[model samples]
Structure formats: structure tokens, C-alpha cells
Target: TPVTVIGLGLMGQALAGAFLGAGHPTTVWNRTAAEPLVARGAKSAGSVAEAVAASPLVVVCVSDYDAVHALLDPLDGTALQGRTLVNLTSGTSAQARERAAWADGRGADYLDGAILAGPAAIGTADAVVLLSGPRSAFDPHASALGGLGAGTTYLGADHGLASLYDAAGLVMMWSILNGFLQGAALLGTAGVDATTFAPFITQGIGTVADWLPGYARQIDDGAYPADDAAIDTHLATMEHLIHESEFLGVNAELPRFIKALADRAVADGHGGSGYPALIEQFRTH
Candidate 1:
């Protein structure tokens, strides 16, 4: 089935290109001109209404929810009625849910989406696009959307889930990078280059990653058994990290913050609990 894409930003262009490359007749629209896509056999819609009228599946990728509404609000009951809208705009879960309601009120089926990969990764095996909406609303257009990525996954019926998952993924990304940066800074103080420390850091991350499932189980069970290293043991290790950072003139703030958390866990009577016990400290604030 043909698809209409409104918004010719880098991501939008990539999506239109993917659909066209996959042999789906693609119609594209942007507030400004999109001649490059036009040259590639994409039909350029002169207005949002034209774009919405071009296909049943209208994929909108834009800067924000404001832009989405600015572009499509006028087309509501007229052009958007009976259409399936797949929005890949970046916004909070609250905004996604609100937009879903707005679209529903406008008589359109809505699917909130988040792109985990960048524009260049679109149409590739590595591309990850998450969508959340009714299964019935998505299944019919799954193949057409899949042309944009091999990892096009339907999250659930909740329209906010995609944005929530996107936010959670960002937390993981930043946490890993921050840990790496702290390690690099500490190692740099001792004449260890980042390249030389890369393998060790990667291996350490893998080891910690392996502990997550068991830690999650402990968390879910509301128990923090000390089958692994206890909080007291972790506190001691954190103190060593702090001492090493201070001794080497590297910033001790990160290690100090970590030690403080462990200290609080110990003070909370979790001294004998496993490292996962620190999650309680996290939960408090």
C-alpha cells in the first residue's frame, strides 16, 4: 500500500526514501520544498491536506508535538478522518498520549512511535523503530512501515509506551557513557590511555550487564539477598575508588556520590544486602 510522509527533515526524508526503495509508492510533504526527494520519484504534496489525502497510512516525523499539531490540526475531520497516523516525533510520554487523544478525537487511528536509530540507519537491519497502539491499527500497515526498518516493533496498546521506552533507552546510553568517561578520567591520571583501557572497560560493562537480570529479580522479589558482594563490600570498594581518584588528582565527585549512596544503603540497615540493595536508596529520591 502507498504511504504519505509529512515532514522532510532528515529522518522524514530517510523514511520516504526507504518506502520508495522498497517499491511502495511514496508521497512526501514538508512545509518547505523537498526537491531532492522529488527527484527520487517521490510525489511532493503541496499541503498537509494533500499529503493526508494521499494515503491511508500517514507517517508524520517532525521536530516536536507543536509542529505536528501546527501542520495537521487544520486537516482534522476533513483530511485526517479515517486515516492511520504514525507519529515519530520526539516528545514526552505525556505529550504522546495527549496527541493520541487529539488524533482519536479527530477521527484518526493513532500510533505513537520512536526511532531508536538515526536517519542513516533507516531501511537497514540495525534500524530500530518502536510503535505503540492497537494491534489492529498496526497489523494492517506493518509491512509498509517495516520498509523503514527491520526492527519495527509494536510495543502495545498504550500510545505512550514508545516515548517511555525511548526515554529509558536514553538513560542506559548516558549511564554507560558517563561510567566510561569517569573510568577514562581516572585512568588518564595514571598514564593509561583510553584505547588501552577500552577492552577492560568493555569487559567490565559486560560483567555488570550479566548481573542485571539477577538484580532485577531481587528487586521484583523485594529482597536483597547477599548471594553476591554485599553492600558493605561495595561500600568498601567505593571508598577505594574515592581514595584512588583523590590520590591521582582526578575528579573524586563521581566516586564520592557513589560512596554516599552505598553509605545510605548501609545506614538503612542493608549493609549485608547485595549491591542491588542500593536500589532502595535510589528509590527514595
Candidate 2:
């Protein structure tokens, strides 16, 4: 089946290249400096409409959702009719949800996706691409997308889910780095170099990674228990960390918030529960 790709940025270029390499009849268009992909057997369409009409599977990526709307609204009436528009743009979950609704209203099927790797990761085995949309609509184009990467996944029908996953990934990334920096600063006071602390945290990180499945099961069941000890046991240790950080004049912000949130959870009657009970604190606001 033919496929169309819009935008010619690093990500868009790699996507179309993958499709073309997979031998899909690919049509591509870009507002910026487009790639010279003609030699790769991809048709460079003059306009977005021509590119969209050239294929049933239309994958779009841009700077953001506004660009997506501006480029497509003019052709939204008929250009997307009966087509599957897979939006791989970066945006909030709300933006994805609304766009999915709008695309459906425009007589098209919509799929949302979020990429978890750099351009070089495209068409590789390790790249993860999270997708959300109609299962039936996705089935036909599954093979074509796998041309981009074998790590492609269908999250569900909710178009917002992929964006949500993208956001969660970012949160985890930042949280990990922030913790590393804070711990490194603390170790500095003890005349310990960051390089020496790195390996220790790597093992600690692996330990926590293994605990996620059990934590996830409890969270999904809306239940948490203190197999080792209740969350209240954490508060005293957290406060000790905060106290040490404050006394040493190291940045105590992380430990403060860590203890602060735990205090709130304790106040909310979760002190008797496990660390997974902290999920409720996040759910509040």
C-alpha cells in the first residue's frame, strides 16, 4: 500500500526513508528544506494535498499541534477523507485527544504516536514508538510502520495515551537526573567523587526497576500494603535525609519535597500503606 509522510525534519525524513526502504509507494512533502529522497524511490509531492491523496496511510510530524492544524485545516475537508492520519507530533495528551476528535469529524481515522528515540534510532530494533488508534485501521498499516522500527506498539484506542506515555517518560528521565545531581552534591560533601557514586546508583536504579512490576500490580488493583514496612517508616528516614542535607548546606529541595509529600500522604491516612500509596497524592493535584 502507498504511504504519505509530511514534514521533512529529522524525524519526518527518517520515517519516509523507512517507508520507502520498505518498498511502500511513498509520497513526501515538506515546508522546510526537504530531503532529496527521489533517488530512494519516493515521490516528492508539490503540495500537502497531493502527498495526502497519494496514499491511504498519511503520517504527519511537525514542530507542534498548531503547525499541524495550520497546514491541514485548509485541506481538512476532503484531503483527509477516508484516510488514516497518524499524527506523530509532540504535544500534550489533551492536544492529541482534541485532534483525534477533529480528524474523525473530518471524515478520517486518526492515530496518535510518540517516538522515544533520536532519528538514528529509526528503522532500528531498539527504538520504541507508542501508537494509539482504531485497532482495525491500524492492522492494515502495521507492517508499513514496522519498517520504521520493530519496537512499534499499539497502546489502545485512546489517542491521548501515547502523548501521556511520552510525558511520563520525560518525568521519569528528569526525576532520575535530578536525583543523581542531588545525591552527587551530597557525596561531594563527604569527599566522594561523583564517578565513585555513579556505579552505586546504577545498581540502585536496577533494583528499583525490578520493583516496578510489583508496584504496578498494587497500583492497578487500587491496593497497597507494607510488606516490609508501612510508608510511615519512610517519613523518619526522609526527614533524616532532609536534616542532613540542610545541615550540610547541600540542596535540600528534593528531600524536603520527598518528605513533604510523604507527610501529606500520611495525613491522608496512607501512613499505614506502602510506597505505592503515594500514587494517591499525585492523583489529587
Candidate 3:
């Protein structure tokens, strides 16, 4: 079966490249007269309808759900029926479910995906595609899907779960970048580039990553006991981060947010509790 791609943006272009490079027959479509340079072995469709009708495994990476609807709306039951639409377009989970239902109504199989890697990395094992919706629907396209990444992670049957996971990934992305920037600023006082400081930062990040298991155990047991690394100790270390930031002429906003919560935790008399206890501060009364 042929694979049809309906967008030619950076990410969409990469997707087409991955499929085409893997020896899959690919047909591409774009609103404008454009085709990605890497689309060497692929064919370009004359129209959106032609693209949709080209293959049962039609992969869409359009701008949004609106554009997706726009392209598929005029198809009636003729173009989209009995096809599988893998919408790599970014959207909310609710929107995914709605579009999945619409596709199902038109007798099309739908799977929502979020790509986590860039175009240059697409055809390689480093690319990652976050997946959600029915496994049976996904099983047929497993090999083609695997071509998009090191492996495709099927989050669950919920159409929205992938979107939720994607949204959460953005939070992690910014948090990591922001923390690194703050660290970079601090390191600049001693004359260092990100490359020079990355090793220590990586170790620090791993140390924090190691906390999750302890935090999860405490959280599930409903006991935030301070066997080690209590909120008070973490608060003291955060002060050092703040002091270093100020001394290094870096932005203090990040550490201040850290201080604000630690202060609240101490005021609530959980300063002696484990760091996981601060998770409650994020909750409301």
C-alpha cells in the first residue's frame, strides 16, 4: 500500500522522506505548489482529494485540525472511506478524538501521533513518534510507523492521551532548557560554555531523575516521610542556587519561584518532610 503525506512543512517533509527512503511508495500533497527536496522517490498528487484517495495509509501533518477538516471535509464518503488516516498534526486530545470519530464515521481508521524529533533525524532510529488510539488499527502500519522513529510508543487506546503526553513534553522541554540557561549564566562567571558545563549539568539532572522512584513510592503510600533529602535540606540548596545566580549576574526568576514554594512548604510545617511533600503545595485547598 502507498503512503500519502498531505503537508510539506519541515516536519511533514521529513516524514515523507522517511517513508520514501524506507522503499514505501509515497504520494505527497500540499496547498501550494511545493514538494520537499528529499521526496526523491515519491510522487506528487494533483490535488488534496487525489492525495487522500491515493492510499489506505494516508499520513497527514498539516498545520492544524482546521486544515485537516478543510482537506477531508469535501471528500464526502468517496475519498476517505476505508482508509487509515495517521494525523501527525499537533492538536489537543479532544480534537483528536473528534477527528477520529469523524474518520470512523466516514469508515476510515485514525491514529493520532506526535513527532518528537526533527526532520534530519526522521528516517533514523533516533526519531520518536508518540502514538495513541486503537492498537488493532495501528498494528497494520507498525513497520511504516517504525520507519518514523527508533520506536513508536503506543500510549493507550485514548485518542487524547498522545496529545496530553505531547503537551507535558513541552513543559519538560522548557524546564530543562530554562534550568540549563540559568546554570550557564552561573557558569559564565567562571568563563564556561554550555559544552564545558554540560557534564556537571547532566549529572545533576540524573540525580534529580533518580528521585522519581522515591517520590512515587511515598506518593502512592500517602506518606511523605523524610528518610533523606527533606524539603528543608532542598530549600537550603535552592538558596545556594539563588545566591550563585545573583552573584553571577543571572536572572533570579527561576530560583525565586523555587524559594516561594519552599517557603510555603516550610510555613505549612512540612519542611521536615521529603521533597515529594511539596507536590501538595501545587494543589489547592
Candidate 4:
């Protein structure tokens, strides 16, 4: 099937490259001329409307939801009729859902998507892309989309789900890195470099990964057991993190805030529950 990729940035270029690599006829368009892609046998459409008319399966890898609309809104809705538009822009779930609805009004099938990897990972096994919308819109062009990544995944009908899942993944990855940052910062107070603590953090993260499934089971059942130890001791240790951060002259308030979450947990009579019970603290927000 013929496909079109809009926005000639790093991500969009790689996506067009991936499609062409898979032997799908590819059309590319950008605000500026996308000359490099034409070298790879891609059709460089002179305009957004021209790109949309060039193919039925159109993928937009612009900077954000706003940028997508800025480009496409100028065109007549009939230009998009019978087309499927896959948006790989990063934005909140609401933005994704709104864009999807807008596409529907334009008579186009829409898939809200979030690419979980960097541009360098595109066209490879490591490139993970989360997509959500109707399978009706996805089925025909699945093969073309597949060329972009081995980890392309389809979440169900709610267009918001892709961005929501992306947000979830962000917090996990962000927290993992931030934890290491705090640990590295504390170690620096004692004259240790980040590289020295890297190895230890690697093992520590793996151990936490191992604990995930067991804790998830408890979370699912709404029963967090004190299998390892109660939150009482866990809270105590969190205080140590706060206390040590202050003693080392590092940022202490962040650790204090974390301990405060656990403090509320203890107040809620979950002192006897496992650390997994902190999910409730998260849920309250």
C-alpha cells in the first residue's frame, strides 16, 4: 500500500526511510523541502494536501498535536476522506483523543500513537510504538506500520490509551533514572562519581524488576501482603534517605516529600502492609 509521511524532522525521515526499506511506495512532505528522502525513491510532496492525496495511509510525526493540526487544518476535509492518519506525536491523552475526534469530523480514520523510542531506533527491533484506535482503521496499513518497528503495539479503541500508556511508561523510566540520580548525588557527597555507582544501580534496578510481578499480583487483588516487611520499617528507611540528604548538603525536600507519602500510608493504617501498598498513595491523586 502507498503511504505518506509528513514532517521531515528526524523521526519523520526515519519513518519514511523505514517504509521505503520495506518496499512500500512512500510519499513525504514537510514545511520545507524533504530532498533527502527523494534520494531514497520517496515522492516528496510539495504540500500537505498533496501528500494526503498521494496516499491512503498517512503517518504524521510532527512535534506535537498542535503542529499536526496546523499542517492538516488548512486542507479541505475531502482531501483526507478514505485516508488513515497515524499520529506519532507526543502529547497528553486528551490531546490525542481530541485530534482523533477531529480526524473523524474530517472523514479520516485516525490512530493516536506515541513512539516510545528515539529516532535512532526506528526501523529496528528496539523501536517501540504504542498505537490506539479502531482496528478498522489499523488493519489495512498494519504491514506498512510494522516496517517502522518490531515493537509496534495496538491498544484498543480508546484513542486516548496510547498517550496514556506512554505517560505510564514515562513515569516508570523517569523514576528509575531519578532514583539513580539521587543515589549518585548522595554518593558524590562522599566523593564518589556517577560511573562508580552505575554498576550498583544496574543490579538494584534488576532486583526491583524481579519484584514487580509479585507486587502486581497483590495490587491486582487489592491485597498487599507484608511478605518482605511492613511499611513501618519502609517508612523508617525513607526517613534515612531524607536525613542523609540533608546531612550531605544535597537536596533534601524531594526525599522528604517521598517520606511524607509513606507517612500518610502509615496514618491510614497501612503500616503493617508491604511497600506495594504505596500504590494507594499514588491512586489518591
Q: Best-fitting candidate, measured by lDDT? A: 2
Q: Using lDDT, rank the candidates from best to worst.
A: 2, 1, 4, 3
Native-to-model Cα distance after best TM-score fit, residue 230 in candidate 2, in Å: 1.1
Give me the overall lDDT of model 4.
0.88
Q: Where does candidate 4 stray beyond 4 Å?
A: none
> On residues 1-285, what C-alpha lDDT tens digit does candidate 3 reach at each position?
588998888888888888887888889888875544434887888898888778889998988989988887888686777788899899998899999888888888889988877778887777778988898779998888888877668888988988989898898999999989888888787888879999988998999889889788888886988887788888878898888888778899999999999899899899899888877887766
TM-score of 2: 0.96
Tens-place lDDT per residue, model 2, 64-139, is 9999989888885877888898999999899999988899889998999999998888889977899998897688
Let me know the TM-score candidate 3 reaches against the reference structure.
Answer: 0.87
Predict model 1's lDDT versus the native. 0.89
**Candidate 3: RMSD to truth:** 2.7
Candidate 4 C-alpha error for residue 166, in Å: 1.5
True-structure lDDT of candidate 2: 0.90
Ranking 2 against 3 by TM-score, winner: 2
TM-score of each: 0.94, 0.96, 0.87, 0.96
